């Protein structure tokens, strides 16, 4: 099926209310001192330290 009417700038900008990516949710490592992903290894130097 084809669209019957054009879509306005208003109705297009409401649809994308929810089209956004979220924060990666990271924490500082207690060696590197640099932000790392949770439950992963520090890329800068690898120390999981379970």
């Amino acid at each position: 099926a084809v669209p019957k009417r054009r879509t306005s700038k208003t109705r297009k900008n409401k649809r994308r209310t929810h089209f956004k990516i979220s924060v990666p949710g990271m924490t500082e490592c207690p060696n590197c001192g640099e932000y790392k992903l949770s439950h992963r290894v520090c890329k800068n130097c690898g120390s999981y330290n379970g």
Partner: protein, 111 residues
């Protein structure tokens, strides 16, 4: 005083870039450098450079210590696009767009 940096004619499309620019607009320098390094999107290795080189003008041309800086302006604009075609079924063709963007970051000491 504010130092700016531009990357003109990057090949990622503009409304793919805009998804990342939001996550950093308003954050702090060291926080912004870390978000662009732990995100899975494809515009991160390019946007990060434009930010790592706004901080090299914030200290070598002017004189500001790079710890107390915030990201004040971060937007992506349009660029000239490339025309391409892909042949479809039964002797017909359709166009393609290879879109381009300009990226811009301004860092400032809130003064």
């Amino acid at each position: 005083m504010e130092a700016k940096a531009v990357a003109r004619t990057i090949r990622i499309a503009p409304r793919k870039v805009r998804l990342v620019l939001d996550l950093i607009r308003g954050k702090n320098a060291a926080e912004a450098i870390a978000i662009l390094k732990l995100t899975n999107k494809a515009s991160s290795p390019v946007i990060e450079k434009v930010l790592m080189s706004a901080l090299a003008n914030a200290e070598h041309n002017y004189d500001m210590n790079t710890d107390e800086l915030v990201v004040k302006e971060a937007y992506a604009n349009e660029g000239p696009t490339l025309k391409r075609f892909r042949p479809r079924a039964q002797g017909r063709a359709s166009a393609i767009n290879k879109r381009t963007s300009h990226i811009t970051i301004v860092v400032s000491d809130a003064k």
